[PDB]
Write an enzyme that holds these catalytic residues in place. Sequence first.
Site, PDB file in Angstrom:
ATOM      1  N   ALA A   1      69.233   2.904  13.402  1.00  0.00           N
ATOM      2  CA  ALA A   1      68.042   3.611  13.855  1.00  0.00           C
ATOM      3  C   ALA A   1      68.190   5.098  13.564  1.00  0.00           C
ATOM      4  CB  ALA A   1      67.798   3.382  15.350  1.00  0.00           C
ATOM      5  N   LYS A   2      67.172   5.679  12.938  1.00  0.00           N
ATOM      6  CA  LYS A   2      67.084   7.124  12.774  1.00  0.00           C
ATOM      7  C   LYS A   2      66.740   7.726  14.138  1.00  0.00           C
ATOM      8  CE  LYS A   2      64.550  10.778  10.949  1.00  0.00           C
ATOM      9  NZ  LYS A   2      63.974  11.944  11.676  1.00  0.00           N
TER      10      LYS A   2
END
Lengths: 328, 323, 328, 323
Positions: free
Chosen positions: D174-175
């Site tokens: 996940a960014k």
Amino acid sequence: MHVRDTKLTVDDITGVVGIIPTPSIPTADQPGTAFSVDLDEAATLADAMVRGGVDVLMTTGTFGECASLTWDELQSFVATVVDAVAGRIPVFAGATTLNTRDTIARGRRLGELGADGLFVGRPMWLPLDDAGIVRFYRDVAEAVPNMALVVYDNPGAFKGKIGTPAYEALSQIPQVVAAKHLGLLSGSAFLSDLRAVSGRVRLLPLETDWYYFARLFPEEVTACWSGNVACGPAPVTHLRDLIRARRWDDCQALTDELEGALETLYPGGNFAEFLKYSIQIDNAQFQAAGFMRTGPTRPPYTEVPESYLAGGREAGKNWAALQQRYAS
Amino acid sequence: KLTVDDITGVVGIIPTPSIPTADQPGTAFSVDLDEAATLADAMVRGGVDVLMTTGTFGECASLTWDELQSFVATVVDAVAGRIPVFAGATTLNTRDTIARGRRLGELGADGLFVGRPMWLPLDDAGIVRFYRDVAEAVPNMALVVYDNPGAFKGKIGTPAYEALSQIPQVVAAKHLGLLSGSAFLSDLRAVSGRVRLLPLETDWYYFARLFPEEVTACWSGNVACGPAPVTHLRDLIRARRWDDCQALTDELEGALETLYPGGNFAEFLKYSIQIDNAQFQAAGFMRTGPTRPPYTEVPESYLAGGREAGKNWAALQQRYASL
Amino acid sequence: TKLTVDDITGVVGIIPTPSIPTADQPGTAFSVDLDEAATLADAMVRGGVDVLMTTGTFGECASLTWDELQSFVATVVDAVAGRIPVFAGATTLNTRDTIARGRRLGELGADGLFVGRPMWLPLDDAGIVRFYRDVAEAVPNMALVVYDNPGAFKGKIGTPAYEALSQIPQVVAAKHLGLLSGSAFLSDLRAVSGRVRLLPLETDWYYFARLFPEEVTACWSGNVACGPAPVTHLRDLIRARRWDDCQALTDELEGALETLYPGGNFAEFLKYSIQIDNAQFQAAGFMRTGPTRPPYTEVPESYLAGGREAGKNWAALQQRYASLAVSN
Amino acid sequence: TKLTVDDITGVVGIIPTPSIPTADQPGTAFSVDLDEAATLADAMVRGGVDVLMTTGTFGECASLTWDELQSFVATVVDAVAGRIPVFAGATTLNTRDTIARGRRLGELGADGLFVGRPMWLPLDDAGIVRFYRDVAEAVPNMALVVYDNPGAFKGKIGTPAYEALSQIPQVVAAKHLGLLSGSAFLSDLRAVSGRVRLLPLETDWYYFARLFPEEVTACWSGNVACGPAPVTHLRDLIRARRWDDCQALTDELEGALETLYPGGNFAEFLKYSIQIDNAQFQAAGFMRTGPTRPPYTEVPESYLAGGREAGKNWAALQQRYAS
Ligand SMILES: [Cl-]
Ligand SMILES: [Cl-]
């Protein structure tokens, strides 16, 4: 340095800065109650914090009901706390009014009653910008130069987060020795504010993230603040000693234990909602932990969704088991 | 005692005049009491129907108690019973507000203009308990409820207004008008004529035409720039001259448009004490000094907006005083 | 285009997009009930609706495929058969796709475009004006209704934008907020100076129409698909200046819709407007639809119950005013 | 899919979409500079970038046409030529369009999808989980990087959503926001229990890597297209546990980028991040690109200067560490 100035500096703010609530008598929620402070419990609580190893004691922040105590009550409570502490640790008296002059007037009297400093929020009817914030604290520091100051950086209560440029200015005020900060709730700003004060102000994170900043910035982040010491101070004093010994694995496991104990505090995990009722939820936490006794909260903060008190009581009971474990 | 029936026409809200060193934290007493008396008398002689003191821009936050009680006493004495006087009393808790309210009534105020504690926001239930507490403790005082969402951290709920309309002391509420359009109409239904809901002078004509039995009063924070535009608006509404009301309303909104930096409402509220102070100075109807600590810092260009708004209104005062 | 502000008068009805029973499955390639769409559009014409609009927020402009939007709009246009103006709701993430969709909907016979703006980042007033000018210049044959929805598009359209939008000939109306943003409604109204029809709510129309009779000659209603008889009657009452009747009917409308908003919370309804409105349309039984399309399928069941109860209350109003022409 | 959380290590580089000089014109039907796209992607591989992603917010996911997005992703994929994993950015207004775009993107050779969620209405935690479960199920051959952007998609992904997402094998990373949401980064981190790589910023990766050396073994960087050498060097220092060096270099990256936020206001920068970042990529000179696509062409000129300064400051760091 002037002989009138406070003798306390950033160097005296080390270890656990414990914030206590103001214990209350059973009729404390009635507008007709003239005096609602339980002074016997106050003194016993203050003494318990000294004996339990709290390094700095502060009173009457938000959950301490700084807003709703009368001035007579604030004076008597602080005087009782100061006498019970008997100079063994520094005592910062929480004094926050709606304006600069009343805060100054309260701060002088609280110093007369023997407090070593003031735990000072700021006027909140209108928000103050950074220039307004710096001018206020400088006003208080000049008028009461004999008091040390802990800056109350509470963005919801006072309508704004204190800016990094304001911290740079605050750190030139000799009376300002510490700030109660947000830790990872405002992680980027904490580090920005840290650089801005250049070791002249102690920036206090939460008990639940002190270890992280302490490892990364060992020379600067040598204290935290905790509003849970009145549920029992042993889990936080032990964290202080784990950090001092640099037992990072032990710090991580204890930190996970503290966050685990507190997780039910926020109704449905909603932190903004807990802040709407922090006075009422904390009060049920202090009751349930059983380390101190207290009655209801003061007008006007007596109304709360009953289910939110469930989270407070579970957190108190959870913390009680931590206190019992580490009380040895 | 005062009832909802007594709140008709222009409910003027005046600032608290200040001496030139009012912005110094070491100044112990900052009120210009000669000006306070002159200002209050001018509101009566200019047709204001109900006078209120020490709301937000009245610096209720930053006056000392000694300043507030001596200012209220001077205003009440200068008014000398001609119109009702509501002393603005707002503290951080119920018990200081009751204690302030009692003494303010003993000094001859007819009622209290009360906002609520805002360290933590109060929910609808806590709001109703606060005003009930005050009303039960000071039953002789009529109450004007201070619905200011930004100052007190939330808009008073329609269910809360329903309960407040069962407290006999609550006779009016300083409301937002079209800045909270749907709420105003919902609140107005909840109070069912038992409470006078006050819209803005720039909103009054619209709500009075639509609800002529209920919206028979407004509040104005501009009367200290000259009350003649607003008392004229009142007479035009009473006469049902809707064209003229609409034209005067456009003139009033026109005069105040620079009050908001870049038209931004919320920026104005962050500095309403500072900006309003500049407007009162420039309008020249009254004299006053600077603002009290801590609210002395403000982007300078926001002060320009207040000054030009004050000069614009002074022109309206000169036009409509000659009627 | 041949349409101007003069053609926008009376009831601008916005309809949902009828769905087949499998419309909530991601594997459903095509989920529009095209038969019901044609029935619905015809019933809007037959029921006195003056302008028809499709695929706004509750019409699921976001979640229909491009093929679904083309076919649904074609069916609606064919069932209306030029009897009233039809505005096809076309709102994408950028100017170029919106222009591409706009041209195609014009080819399928729509008279104009009901257009919201790109939302990935907010557009300032310069960006908002540029976007609509771009659309208007690339599809000059389509009249435009501006979709002023602060939550959906991340901000309120500023009054200087409305002043500029009122110099674009294609811009003939704006779906506005009425008393939910009353000061701005009147600022925007001055700004457009009668060149744009500012459409308030059905619950607000009477107030603005009485005060500004030459300008506020139309409102929008998203409830027509529950039965248009109450709204068209409100039009007739406003035209006859039957103000006491208008007030009484407006109360009846707000009353029928009170259960839309959970616990009275308008903001909470807006998080689930697609799901709640879908429940309302089903319960009112004037049209048939299935469930909503992905990704907007999750909603507390309590919120659905409030929408259904709103649907049943509006149905009673439809029965009453549909039969007022012929009854006792 | 064969990509797992274990493959997400080191620098996750996010590149913008190079544009032709007429890219800011709405009549320009095809605005991608594919020659520059190919050169940049190769430059990222040769510069040490471990994972490549395209078409996030500043890559103008919102404003490219579908034909543009296919051609750009194909060109990047061909230029990378299997050397490192490539995550194609696909975010639409709904589940079905995202999936169909995502299938085509895998057919063009992308190894996974960099995916944000529908944002017309905000999705709650159950709707967030259902969206990503739907994409994962429809295209199980594609690993996924969750795009946690609260401003873009109207809400921070909740920690309960992360717990559920960590049970979907396709979700590898996940960014995230790092110290911009530090308390939540840690809650999310505990919730995924090492099954999803949570990517902090390049400016706080060192802090989180030191505290959690076995979990936070990667960051994302949106500045690789200004020269990737400062960020791959940070990766190496982190691996070597050279903490003093890590701190000094972290300070250098923050120092070079401070001009980016107008008057230090992050929320203001986010309102114009596409425009401002564009100015930074032009100034840094590591790549060439034209202007931004409609509709994000309007921006105060002073903000661009702040982006230009940041580009030049970064180009000095690139030259220092590409040594
Ligand atoms: Cl009339
Ligand atoms: Cl170490």
